[PDB]
Design a binder for this molecule. Sequence first.
Ligand SMILES: NS(=O)(=O)c1ccc(NC(=[Se])Nc2ccc(F)cc2)cc1
Ligand SMILES: *[C@@H]1O[C@H](CO)[C@@H](O)[C@H](O)[C@H]1NC(C)=O
Ligand SMILES: *[C@@H]1O[C@H](CO)[C@@H](O)[C@H](O)[C@H]1NC(C)=O
Ligand SMILES: [Zn+2]
Length: 276
Amino acid sequence: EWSYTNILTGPETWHEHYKNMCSGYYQSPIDLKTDISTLDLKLKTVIIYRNTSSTETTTIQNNGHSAEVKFPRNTWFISFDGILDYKYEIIQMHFHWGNTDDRGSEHTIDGFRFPLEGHIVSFRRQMYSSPSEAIGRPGGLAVLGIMHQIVESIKYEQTAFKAYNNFSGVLNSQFVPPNNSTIDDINLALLLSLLNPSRYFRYLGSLTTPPCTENVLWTVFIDPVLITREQINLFRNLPYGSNEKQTRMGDNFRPIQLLNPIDTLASRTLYRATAR
Ligand SMILES: NS(=O)(=O)c1ccc(NC(=[Se])Nc2ccc(F)cc2)cc1
Ligand SMILES: *[C@@H]1O[C@H](CO)[C@@H](O)[C@H](O)[C@H]1NC(C)=O
Ligand SMILES: *[C@@H]1O[C@H](CO)[C@@H](O)[C@H](O)[C@H]1NC(C)=O
Ligand SMILES: [Zn+2]
């Protein structure tokens, strides 16, 4: 078993308890270094889009380590090439945050931590027929990282919580693991429009929880969307699962991994995109 906050099962132990693949050399998260990265003008604007025929419900669960929104199949998609032909299908979105406002994100940008990093997880439907087929297979997944930053003066409608529809009020101290609830759908298109979808880091990496599978195409947007202190504190009301030492959920982020650990057998490169 694993945790964030119990020293015995925490992130420093994952390379031993889950050798495949938390001991690998293409792990995430990393520090996204603007100066070190390679600008690749070929990397296009990201588009998130919905199947307007889909009517099934969205749910959210406290899984003991995060709040995880589970989307119905065949409903939300990502395009990286401008074509709306269902190459990447979104599965779930979950979040990583801090006990305090100066930490929480998994990635850093030039060493800087944000209070809340959201991960929109998709599978390469272009190749694999289902999430369960893709999740353990090479090149199966693509994850979007969305940084959030706290502002003191803002209307609700301009915060990320408008896109999330406040998660239908489920973020509270009574939302105990492993409870799940039906919630209003998340307007992921609106969420993406709150930042610049052309301006992002891109690299090949891993899941950031065990078993840390090295099959994730990462895109991390540089500009954050905006939330309030009230909204970050809602996440902090969730209780951790019983695997954890800490009672309230927070600091559910993995430590930074190197782009190229010294034992790598083929270095990877950190790429960056910007608008045309
Ligand atoms: N933090 S993260 O974004 O790297 C990340 C970590 C773990 C992860 N796992 C998933 Se989606 N597992 C799963 C989903 C569907 C299924 F059929 C079976 C298993 C996704 C993302
Ligand atoms: C869109 O939703 C409909 C209705 O649920 C479904 O039958 C169809 O296959 C979906 N389209 C895609 C491309 O997943
Ligand atoms: C969500 O929460 C905020 C804070 O209370 C509130 O202003 C907003 O009206 C709520 N959104 C709805 C109506 O779902
Ligand atoms: Zn994550």
